[PDB]
Design an enzyme around this catalytic site. Structure first.
Site, short mmCIF file in Angstrom:
data_model
loop_
_atom_site.label_atom_id
_atom_site.label_comp_id
_atom_site.label_asym_id
_atom_site.label_seq_id
_atom_site.Cartn_x
_atom_site.Cartn_y
_atom_site.Cartn_z
N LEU A 119 0.89 -1.28 -0.07
CA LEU A 119 0.02 0.03 0.05
C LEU A 119 0.97 1.19 0.06
O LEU A 119 0.10 2.47 -0.49
CB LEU A 119 -0.89 -0.09 1.27
N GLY A 125 5.19 5.09 4.26
CA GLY A 125 4.86 6.34 4.86
C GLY A 125 6.32 6.98 5.68
O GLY A 125 7.37 6.30 5.69
N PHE A 157 6.08 6.48 8.81
CA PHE A 157 6.09 5.57 9.82
C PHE A 157 6.85 4.34 9.52
O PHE A 157 8.26 3.87 10.03
CB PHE A 157 4.76 5.17 10.23
N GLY A 158 6.46 3.46 8.55
CA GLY A 158 6.83 2.21 8.13
C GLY A 158 6.27 1.94 6.70
O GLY A 158 5.63 2.73 6.01
N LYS A 207 1.36 -3.56 9.04
CA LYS A 207 2.48 -2.67 9.04
C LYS A 207 3.64 -3.25 9.82
O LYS A 207 3.70 -4.20 10.48
CB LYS A 207 2.23 -1.45 9.98
N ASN A 245 -9.73 6.50 2.25
CA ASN A 245 -10.19 7.73 3.48
C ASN A 245 -11.11 8.49 2.88
O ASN A 245 -11.89 8.51 1.66
CB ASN A 245 -8.68 8.51 3.24
N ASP A 263 -3.51 15.17 14.52
CA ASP A 263 -3.70 15.32 13.04
C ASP A 263 -5.07 14.90 12.71
O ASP A 263 -5.18 14.27 11.64
CB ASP A 263 -2.67 14.80 12.22
N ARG A 281 -8.43 12.96 5.67
CA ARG A 281 -7.35 12.08 5.26
C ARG A 281 -7.04 10.98 6.00
O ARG A 281 -6.63 9.95 5.88
CB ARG A 281 -6.07 12.76 4.80
N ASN A 282 -7.28 10.98 7.64
CA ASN A 282 -7.15 10.03 8.80
C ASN A 282 -8.30 9.60 9.07
O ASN A 282 -8.15 9.22 10.20
CB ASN A 282 -6.28 10.91 9.88
N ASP A 290 -4.60 6.27 12.61
CA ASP A 290 -3.03 6.82 12.98
C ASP A 290 -3.48 7.76 14.38
O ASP A 290 -2.82 8.99 14.33
CB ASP A 290 -2.67 8.09 11.85
C1 LIG Z 1 -7.51 -3.05 3.54
C2 LIG Z 1 -7.45 -1.58 3.06
C3 LIG Z 1 -7.54 -1.49 1.61
O1 LIG Z 1 -7.86 -2.34 1.25
N1 LIG Z 1 -7.16 -0.18 0.99
C4 LIG Z 1 -7.07 0.88 1.34
C5 LIG Z 1 -6.67 1.86 0.05
C6 LIG Z 1 -6.51 3.27 0.28
N2 LIG Z 1 -6.15 4.06 -0.78
C7 LIG Z 1 -5.29 5.42 -0.76
C8 LIG Z 1 -4.74 5.79 -1.83
N3 LIG Z 1 -5.46 5.51 -3.04
C9 LIG Z 1 -4.96 6.28 -4.28
C10 LIG Z 1 -5.72 7.23 -4.95
C11 LIG Z 1 -5.66 4.29 -3.32
C12 LIG Z 1 -6.81 3.77 -2.05
C13 LIG Z 1 -6.63 3.75 1.72
C14 LIG Z 1 -7.21 3.02 2.50
C15 LIG Z 1 -7.42 1.83 2.70
N4 LIG Z 1 -7.67 1.16 3.75
C16 LIG Z 1 -6.48 0.95 4.63
C17 LIG Z 1 -5.48 1.47 4.76
C18 LIG Z 1 -4.73 1.48 5.76
N5 LIG Z 1 -3.18 1.99 5.78
C19 LIG Z 1 -2.72 2.29 5.06
C20 LIG Z 1 -2.88 1.92 7.18
O2 LIG Z 1 -1.54 2.31 7.39
N6 LIG Z 1 -3.45 1.44 8.28
C21 LIG Z 1 -3.01 1.21 9.59
C22 LIG Z 1 -3.64 2.16 10.68
CL1 LIG Z 1 -5.13 3.22 10.05
C23 LIG Z 1 -3.19 2.55 12.13
O3 LIG Z 1 -3.74 3.33 12.51
C24 LIG Z 1 -3.72 3.43 14.03
C25 LIG Z 1 -2.20 1.62 12.33
C26 LIG Z 1 -1.63 0.83 11.56
O4 LIG Z 1 -0.40 -0.06 12.14
C27 LIG Z 1 0.05 0.07 13.45
C28 LIG Z 1 -1.87 0.52 10.19
CL2 LIG Z 1 -0.95 -0.63 9.04
N7 LIG Z 1 -5.07 0.50 6.75
C29 LIG Z 1 -6.46 0.18 6.83
N8 LIG Z 1 -7.18 0.42 5.86
#
Ligand SMILES: *CCC(=O)Nc1cc(N2CCN(CC)CC2)ccc1Nc1cc(N(C)C(=O)Nc2c(Cl)c(OC)cc(OC)c2Cl)ncn1
Length: 302
Positions: free
Chosen positions: A22, A25, A27-28, A52, A106, A161, A165-166, A179
């Site tokens: 995905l 960042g 972060f990681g 992550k 988001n 934040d 977006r979050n 986040d």
């Molecule tokens: C399973 C989620 C998924 O299928 N996809 C997804 C895609 C997006 N996009 C963003 C950019 N677009 C380009 C235009 C493509 C679509 C956005 C969100 C999701 N879901 C998603 C993403 C994440 N991420 C990226 C994380 O980092 N999640 C995560 C969070 Cl939120 C937290 O919050 C405390 C902590 C950790 O780790 C400790 C992580 Cl990994 N997560 C979940 N869903």
């Protein structure tokens, strides 16, 4: 180098099928995955999840940061309107922290994609959205985020934040705050933009921006910017305003205009979130109650 095990959170590596990246960042690195048997009472079910892990420019501090983010999420506990911890792979290999996957991306994007159709004068005249949101749907996004934030606040968590977006959106259109386990803590790069090219300072309360004071009340100010994002269907705050001009706007007591298709009452809520005096802003508990009342009275016919 090597970590304690918490059996209640531990998932065997063989139960996790890593999938496409995905992205990295600050972060990681995060990757999509499939996890088998997350629940004891359901060991043959696959769940889509996000994972992550550290990036191979393996920093040192970053490991203690990733651990800390996991540990904080354990302490906060579960809520419908946050992104929840589901598991971890901590033994005999790289640390993987496993969380809920929100399939609709988001909130900023989710709102942008559901803007009404392109017209002859639009940037995008062939924009023809799949789905549309009623006034009630929009109020309901606001309510759900506020409820998420009320929960976090009751666990003594300050986000620092909050922005569309979050907030992430599930397949069932549930809003989940993302986040919230992080720290900053310093003032970063007031000029660093987001991937989408926006400046996070535009969501920051003046006392946080000028006096580094971050409280639940400063998150309430950010929530008011978030409300404005919702009701502009993913609008960008202060477009074309650089940091130095933003400081001046805030020092003058400037406040954003009421969006069209926003009631005077929701605009008042925004403006109250943007009280210059932090003690005078509403709390998240009050925003939850107010938004609950407004939802019930808001039309889903337009
Ligand atoms: C399973 C989620 C998924 O299928 N996809 C997804 C895609 C997006 N996009 C963003 C950019 N677009 C380009 C235009 C493509 C679509 C956005 C969100 C999701 N879901 C998603 C993403 C994440 N991420 C990226 C994380 O980092 N999640 C995560 C969070 Cl939120 C937290 O919050 C405390 C902590 C950790 O780790 C400790 C992580 Cl990994 N997560 C979940 N869903």
């Amino acid at each position: 180098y090597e970590l304690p095990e918490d059996p209640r959170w531990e998932l065997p590596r063989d139960r996790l099928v890593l999938g496409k990246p995905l992205g990295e960042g600050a972060f990681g690195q995060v990757v999509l995955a499939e996890a088998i048997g997350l629940d004891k009472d359901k060991p043959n079910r696959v769940t889509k999840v996000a994972v992550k892990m550290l990036k191979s420019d393996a920093t040192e501090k970053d490991l203690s940061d990733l651990i800390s983010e996991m540990e904080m999420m354990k302490m906060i506990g579960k809520h419908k309107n946050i992104i929840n911890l589901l598991g971890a792979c901590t033994q005999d290999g790289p640390l993987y922290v496993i969380v809920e996957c929100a399939s609709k991306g988001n909130l900023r994007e989710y709102l942008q994609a559901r803007r009404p159709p392109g017209l002859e004068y639009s940037y995008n005249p062939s924009h023809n959205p799949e789905e549309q949101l009623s006034s009630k749907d929009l109020v309901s996004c606001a309510y759900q985020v506020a409820r998420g934030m009320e929960y976090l606040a009751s666990k003594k968590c300050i986000h620092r934040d909050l922005a569309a977006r979050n907030v992430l959106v599930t397949e069932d259109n549930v809003m989940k705050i993302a986040d919230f386990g992080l720290a900053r803590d310093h003032h970063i790069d007031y000029y660093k933009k987001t991937t989408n090219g926006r400046l996070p300072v535009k969501w920051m309360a003046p006392e946080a921006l000028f006096d580094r004071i971050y409280t639940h009340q400063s998150d309430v100010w950010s929530f008011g910017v978030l409300l404005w994002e919702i009701f502009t269907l993913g609008g960008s705050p202060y477009p074309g305003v650089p940091v130095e001009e933003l400081f001046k706007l805030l020092k003058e007591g400037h406040r954003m205009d009421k969006p069209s298709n926003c009631t005077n009452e929701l605009y008042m809520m925004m403006r109250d979130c943007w009280h210059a005096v932090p003690s005078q802003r509403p709390t998240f508990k009050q925003l939850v109650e107010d938004l609950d009342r407004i939802v019930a009275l808001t039309s889903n016919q337009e």
